[PDB]
Design a protein around this ligand. Structure first.
Ligand SMILES: [Mg+2]
Ligand SMILES: [Mg+2]
Ligand SMILES: [Mg+2]
Ligand SMILES: [Mg+2]
Ligand SMILES: [Mg+2]
Ligand SMILES: [Mg+2]
Ligand SMILES: [Mg+2]
Ligand SMILES: [Zn+2]
Lengths: 92, 196
RNA sequence: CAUCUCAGUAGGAGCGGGAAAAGAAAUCAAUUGAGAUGCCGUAAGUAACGGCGAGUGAAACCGGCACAGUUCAAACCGAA
RNA sequence: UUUACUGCAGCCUGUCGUUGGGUUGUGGUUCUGGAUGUACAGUGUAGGUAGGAGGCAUCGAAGCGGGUGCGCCAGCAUUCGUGGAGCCGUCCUUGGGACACUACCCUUCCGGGACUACGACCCUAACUCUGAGAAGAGGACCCCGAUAGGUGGGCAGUUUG
């Protein structure tokens, strides 16, 4: 499973066909100031705590490949529905 | 500045750790530890605070040092089956402050007088000390008085065990007005105790 | 079913009168105003909370009943 | 009942309070004696840097010592002297930085004195035990209040379609 580093595809902002650069979308780290974290602080007391003592869930046999297509003119990225592959070479 | 000596005493007790009062604390703590739970003392330890809280030099007015432990409400683990939220009791401090406990013990010791106010006078690693001002309502000097005859009334009995003192009203959530006091006035019981 | 709900309920300890509790803004408002407290009506099953599930859940403005404001500490005199 | 899910007592340990006085090893904090600042040296020591330079000087300025701040035992300071001129640099040692007094405000030097936090040791007056008491034995440790992490079928509520 390869895919070119660059190719020519419609840019939804420029509304024209021109080169794009493909890259990998890396999952960030959850911050501590969102309201879920504040709720987790407010709900920690004595004993059980509901959602925040849930065991972590399982996983699926193969995840999707999450990619971001960034234009080379306006530098504005856009995302597309992603396929599912095990080994993903990124064939420039 | 033309200033009374009550002001100087007030300043001296403003920051105890950085004046001559620290040495006096060192001497006094030993004598206080040797004493009992409740003790009658002739003069208040801090004159300015007592005069501010309504102390006068007359018959029928008594002042007492009470002794109360530190820490929260010492609570027992439930014997039978709780639900894991009511099962824990080690971190559950009380809902009653320590001044209130002190004044209630003083009231329990003196069955004929009535509590007026109290104030903080010292503390160490095991104990805290307060002084409680008590007034006798059946003494003629109090009866003749115009600023104290309100205590000779049939609604002032048990004034400390019904949360009518200043610390009691602090603990009832009625030290202020407005936002936050929706369920604390005119009483805790009136709203099914959802305030406090 | 564990947070939640049942519910500050049932129950317990203390105090206490013909009533008790509260009570004279370090308040509520919004551009500019009102002027102690209590109780009834409404706001309203709204805002808010919540395995955002089941459920829980106000206040202010406004209309009434009844109306009431004051006393110490200190600065000045020093036993009057 | 247990190495089922979630918790709670008990116990082990860090930190804060109770909690004081000294011995020193720690590090800056904080403070002096010199701009200490110096390789293409120097008549000069980049008196940081710098009005890319002009005031000092028998009315005090030099080469040298174990070497005086310090460094390249050179030499700006005048210090203990020593000869009895280093002057600025528009002779810039034509510069890493090129340099002159009212400025060193600042590489630094660092009795590091000073409050602080750590590891160890000593003392008694808090505190603890024993005794009717004198007193004796320990001692800022332990116990205690709070908080953080662990172990925990000792115990509780449930699930096991
Ligand atoms: Mg007792
Ligand atoms: Mg009343
Ligand atoms: Mg009775
Ligand atoms: Mg009142
Ligand atoms: Mg409720
Ligand atoms: Mg079991
Ligand atoms: Mg059940
Ligand atoms: Zn584009």
């Amino acid at each position: 499973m390869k895919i070119p580093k660059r190719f020519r595809t419609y840019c939804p902002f420029c509304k024209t066909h021109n080169e794009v650069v493909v890259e990998r979308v890396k999952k960030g780290q959850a911050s501590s100031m969102t309201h879920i974290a504040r709720q987790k602080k407010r709900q920690e007391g004595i004993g059980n705590s509901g959602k925040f003592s849930k065991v972590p869930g399982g996983d699926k046999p193969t995840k999707r490949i999450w990619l971001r297509y960034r234009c080379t003119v306006c530098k504005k990225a856009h995302q597309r529905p992603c396929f599912r592959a095990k080994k993903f070479e990124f064939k420039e | 500045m033309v200033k009374s000596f009550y002001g100087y005493v007030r300043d001296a007790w403003k920051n105890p750790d950085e004046t001559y009062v620290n040495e006096l604390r060192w001497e006094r703590l030993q004598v206080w530890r040797k004493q009992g739970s409740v003790t009658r003392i002739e003069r208040p330890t801090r004159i300015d605070r007592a005069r501010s809280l309504g102390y006068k030099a007359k018959q029928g007015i008594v002042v007492v040092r009470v002794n109360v432990r530190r820490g929260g409400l010492g609570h027992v683990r439930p014997n039978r089956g709780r639900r894991t939220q009511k099962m824990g009791k080690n971190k559950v401090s009380g809902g009653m402050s320590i001044q209130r406990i002190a004044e209630v013990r003083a009231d329990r010791r003196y069955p004929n007088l009535e509590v007026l106010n109290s104030y903080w006078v010292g503390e160490d690693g095991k104990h805290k000390w307060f002084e409680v001002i008590l007034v006798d309502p059946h003494h003629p000097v109090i009866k003749s008085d115009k600023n104290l005859n309100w205590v000779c009334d049939p609604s002032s009995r048990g004034r400390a065990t019904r949360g009518k003192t200043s610390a009691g009203r602090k603990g009832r959530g009625m030290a202020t007005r407005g936002k936050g006091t929706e369920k604390t006035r005119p009483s805790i019981r009136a709203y099914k105790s959802r305030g406090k």
